[PDB]
Design a binder for these strands. Structure first.
Lengths: 214, 109, 562
RNA sequence: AUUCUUGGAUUUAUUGAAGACUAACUACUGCGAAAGCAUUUGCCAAGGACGUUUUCAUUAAUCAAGAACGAAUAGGGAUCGGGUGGUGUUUUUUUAAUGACCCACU
RNA sequence: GUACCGAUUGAAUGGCUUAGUGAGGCCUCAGGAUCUGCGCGGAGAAUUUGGACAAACUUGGUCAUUUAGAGGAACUAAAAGUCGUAACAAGUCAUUAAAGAAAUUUAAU
């Protein structure tokens, strides 16, 4: 006989600035005692959540956001970005028969030394008045187009990190920048980056972490 | 307006699993599965027993204070049958009929 | 979503409240003693009289309710006197309709018992108002009918509060019982913000509590626990007669599951039992009524243990009561509640694994019942024997080094002493029962003809037969010379757990996993009678010298007699 | 029926390890004499076809023995690779121009 | 299982006791790791000659009882076991007021 939920902390989640509503949801931790209080112990839970519920608009039903938990103050816990996710169904939907699948990735260091491996997926479209049913690529275009994307990825990154970088990711300006260069070879369809991940955050830096906070 | 979590129904063969957890997912609440409420070893994934266990999970949910939830359905997957079970519908039907709130559910197969 | 209204002790439905879509948590009775109102997590309040009128719909705030208390001119829950919330707030209202008089916002922690105990005057010239149920802090509240409220002092020396109290006359100089969920209840002063004394008897969270109808410094006080009640002294500090916090009595109930039973009294009077709780309940057999009020000693439960109790055993007179637990020790308790340390004879440390079996040698007057024969899960059996002083008085070290007997590879289940002190047979899971001498520790016999590990072995009291229980749905009876099987009883539809002989040596009584209790004869090996009152698994057995009144073990605390 | 389990089985979330493979697209497509060949990237030679107003000049064709590897008649349409022509389009508010597309031929 | 005869005086205990073993503190000749102090003292651990007080530990034997008890004979349990013999029995409607959103409360005919 314990009934632990009469002992559990009730608790909420605060989100950073460059978004819409900064209240997200509810979690539960533990009663703060001496010898394992609730605060200092774990701090490492992650909340993967779609940003359509974070912004309200419905042109972003994909593109989940993973979150990383950093620093709390008395039922007020901030969070940091952790990684970009994609839906299941749409990547099961977007891969059509009789077309060409193109993917790419690179690893890079940013302004503060966050190291991220970005992904990039690329699919080919058909055109008006096309006679044949397949319209594939020529496998030497693909050696070029994978290369063309690669310098576009590096010129975007290593300047003015996630405060601006995730803000570049949301209206997918970079995907249009890919389209602006790919058009001289073979045009394309839906192209997204579909995934990002963090592996090498250097240090805590609470002071610069409070720049997104008001 | 509401307090939210995730319910995460794992609909496998020969038994179906549920565990309503917090929004982080690491903190679980009131797991109890479908095979527990029957002793025949053949109806551990039946939809009739799935309605009984999901009613009990919905009972313990509001008894804590949780009022709304989402769910991520999940078949076995990998090298396996890749298809959701019978009572995965019956688990979702019984908790929605209990009076809980549902929004924007997905698949994690 | 059920709140049913009944009249007198028939229990017939006057009116059932199921109207609101949130479920109701709590229910209480008015100071007018005819009206009622219940609390929910949606703050839906309706005042209902039972003739029936279920009055004006009050809806002015959400939030959750976890406590309620009434008043003679503001007869409603904490939605009208104050505001039980999920963040902590006080809202001042009137007996008139839904207009809000005052609001009061102080709390940074969630609290619901904001007016969990009254202030009687509601002018407070020397009076105060207490509050706390989840905030784990206590604040001294003023009452103001047309003004804002004031804080007098706070109480941070606690760590958890769940309910509060306030003195009936209202001075607060007298005793204030304060219950907290940290297994701590205290006596405090409200005029000084000082604790009188703190009492730490439980290790379990203190539950909710209502009010006694008694005056000031009370007569007796009832403290809530799990399936048991206790009465405590009312001073606990030098107020009237005594101090230095104690417990007056601890009246026991029953636990659902029973692991073992053993008759305690020398005239087969008292029964003590081993359950999942680390407590010793001595109620059932001499108490044909409900809760214990008629034991021929002081009513008290024992605790010295850290874990659950697996088994217990005592000799005939019942002065040495050996009990076994998972905390790697052995504790023996005394009948008449007098000893040197607490009530424990000694605590036997030296076990390499848990102790699930314990046993006493045969009775004479002393000596052998002063001794102890215990069995642990470290594949050895230990005989604690110190003969030159009185044994079981201090901590004994006689068998930890190399005097322990080891011939096993699987765990023991029970042990049984013979009517003489010469031999003893023990049963285990390795499909054999072994007879050993008590004097030296040499393997006297090995009995291995089985299909499953063995739970219980029983000697008969004219010691010409041997009974043992197995898992091939049979009970095996072997000779005193053990060169051949005496009888092989078959007919149980499930596995048998415990078999034992009656003190008149006429019947072998079987307790197994049938859901049923069968009595067989030891004269023809036939079925005397089957006995049916049960629907759960059986665990233990104890019979008296007479043979008619026989108690059994269940999974729901039901004890039957015949 | 076997198996595991309150030193907490299953599951949850986190991390490391391992070997294995490139899921949808993947075709009666492409390559290799067959055996065989599907992750990105780089290196290394090699091969055929197409184009050619470049070169030697019958140096050639088929096959017991022997070697290596392997268990041991002429149209119709589609499509792949190349080439050419364009009273052709599109990318082009960027000067130009790669590229794709389509018509026609081989 | 109880009472009775009995070898082994084995184990335990009691009376006596041959014999062996033997704690502890006291004084003194020496011995000195160490001390607040106008030529050094209180105080103080180890070792050590001789003398005096001295409880105590172990075994064996004699005799009694118990236990174990060869060997002997009864009583009780087992009405039991098998086999044979013998006969007997046995299937508070309506309308409509007033409070209340609505339930419900009261009134009226």
């Amino acid at each position: 006989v314990v009934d632990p939920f009469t002992r559990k902390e009730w608790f909420d989640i605060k989100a950073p600035s460059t978004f819409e509503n900064r209240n997200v949801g509810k979690t539960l931790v533990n009663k703060s005692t001496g010898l394992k209080s609730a605060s200092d112990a774990l701090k490492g839970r992650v909340v993967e959540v779609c940003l359509a519920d974070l912004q309200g608009s419905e042109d972003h039903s994909f593109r989940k956001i993973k979150l990383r938990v950093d620093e709390v103050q008395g039922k007020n816990l901030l969070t940091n970005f952790h990684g970009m996710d994609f839906t299941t169904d749409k990547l099961r939907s977007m891969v059509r028969k009789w077309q060409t699948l193109i993917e790419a990735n690179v690893t890079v260091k940013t302004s503060d030394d966050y190291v991220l491996r970005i992904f990039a997926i690329a699919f080919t479209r058909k055109q008006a008045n096309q006679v044949k049913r397949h319209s594939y690529a020529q496998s030497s275009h693909i050696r070029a187009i994978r290369k063309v994307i690669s310098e576009i990825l590096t010129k975007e990154v290593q300047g003015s990190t996630l405060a601006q970088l995730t803000s570049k990711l949301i209206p997918e300006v970079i995907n249009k920048e890919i389209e602006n260069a790919t058009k001289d070879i073979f045009p394309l369809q839906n192209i997204h980056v579909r995934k990002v991940k963090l592996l090498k955050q250097p240090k805590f830096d609470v002071g610069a972490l409070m720049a997104l906070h008001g | 307006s509401q307090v939210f979590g995730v319910a995460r129904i794992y609909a496998s063969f020969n038994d179906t699993f549920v565990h309503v957890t917090d929004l982080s997912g690491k903190e679980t609440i009131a797991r109890v599965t479908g095979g527990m409420k029957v002793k025949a070893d053949r109806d551990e994934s039946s939809p009739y027993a799935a309605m009984l266990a999901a009613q009990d999970v919905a009972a313990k949910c509001k008894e804590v204070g949780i009022t709304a939830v989402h769910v991520k359905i999940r078949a076995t997957g990998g090298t396996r049958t890749k298809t959701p079970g019978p009572g995965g519908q019956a688990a979702l039907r019984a908790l929605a009929r209990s009076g809980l709130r549902i929004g924007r559910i997905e698949d994690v197969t | 979503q059920l709140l049913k209204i009944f009249h007198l002790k028939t229990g017939k439905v006057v009116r059932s409240m199921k109207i609101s879509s949130p479920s109701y948590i709590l229910d209480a009775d008015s100071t007018s003693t005819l009206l009622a109102v219940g609390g929910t997590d949606g703050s839906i309040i309706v005042v209902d009289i039972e003739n029936g009128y279920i009055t004006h719909s009050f809806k002015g705030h959400g939030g959750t309710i976890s406590s309620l208390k009434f008043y003679g001119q503001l007869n409603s829950k904490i939605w009208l006197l104050a505001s039980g919330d999920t963040n902590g707030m006080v809202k001042v209202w009137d007996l008139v309709k839904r207009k809000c008089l005052h609001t009061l916002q102080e709390h940074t922690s969630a609290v619901r018992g904001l007016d969990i105990i009254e202030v009687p005057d509601n002018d407070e010239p020397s009076l105060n108002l207490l509050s706390g149920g989840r905030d784990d802090i206590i604040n001294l509240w003023d009452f103001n009918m047309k003004k804002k409220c004031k804080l007098l002092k706070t109480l941070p020396v606690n760590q958890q509060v769940e309910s509060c109290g306030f003195l009936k006359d209202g001075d607060g100089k007298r005793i204030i019982y304060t219950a907290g969920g940290d297994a701590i209840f205290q006596l405090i002063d409200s005029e000084s913000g000082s604790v009188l004394k703190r009492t730490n008897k439980p290790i379990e969270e203190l539950f909710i509590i209502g009010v006694l109808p008694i005056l000031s410094n009370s007569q007796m006080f009832l403290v809530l626990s799990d399936q048991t009640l206790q009465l405590i002294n009312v001073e606990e500090d030098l107020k009237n007669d005594e101090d230095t916090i104690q417990v007056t009595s601890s009246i026991a109930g029953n636990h659902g599951i029973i692991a073992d039973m053993r008759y305690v009294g020398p005239e087969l009077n008292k029964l003590a039992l081993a359950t999942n709780s680390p407590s010793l309940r001595i109620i059932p057999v001499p108490d044909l009524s409900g809760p214990e009020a008629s034991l021929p000693l002081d009513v008290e439960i024992y605790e010295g243990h850290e874990d659950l109790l697996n088994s217990l055993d005592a000799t005939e007179d019942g002065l040495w009561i050996a009990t076994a637990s998972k905390d790697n020790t052995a504790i023996v308790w005394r009948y008449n509640e007098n000893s040197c340390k607490f009530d424990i004879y000694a605590k036997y440390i030296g076990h390499s694994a848990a102790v699930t079996a314990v046993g006493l040698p045969n009775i004479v007057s002393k000596g052998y019942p002063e001794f102890l024969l215990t069995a642990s899960n470290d594949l050895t059996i230990k005989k604690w024997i110190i003969p030159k002083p009185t044994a079981s008085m201090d901590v004994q070290i006689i068998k930890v080094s190399e005097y322990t007997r080891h011939a096993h590879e699987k765990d023991i289940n029970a042990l049984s002493v013979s009517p003489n002190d010469s031999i003893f047979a023990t049963a285990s899971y390795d499909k054999t029962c072994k007879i050993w001498n008590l004097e030296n520790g040499e393997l006297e016999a090995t009995l291995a003809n089985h299909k499953r590990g063995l739970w219980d072995v029983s000697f008969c009291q004219y010691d010409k037969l041997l009974a043992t229980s197995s898992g091939d749905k049979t009970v095996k009876i072997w000779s005193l010379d053990t060169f051949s099987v005496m009888k092989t009883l078959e007919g149980h539809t499930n596995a048998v757990q415990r078999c034992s002989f009656i003190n008149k040596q006429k019947q072998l009584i079987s307790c197994g996993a049938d859901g049923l209790i069968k009595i067989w004869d030891c004269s023809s090996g036939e079925c005397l009678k089957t006995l049916d009152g049960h629907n759960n698994r059986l665990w233990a057995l104890s019979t008296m010298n007479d043979g008619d009144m026989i108690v059994s073990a269940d999974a729901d605390g039901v004890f039957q007699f015949w």
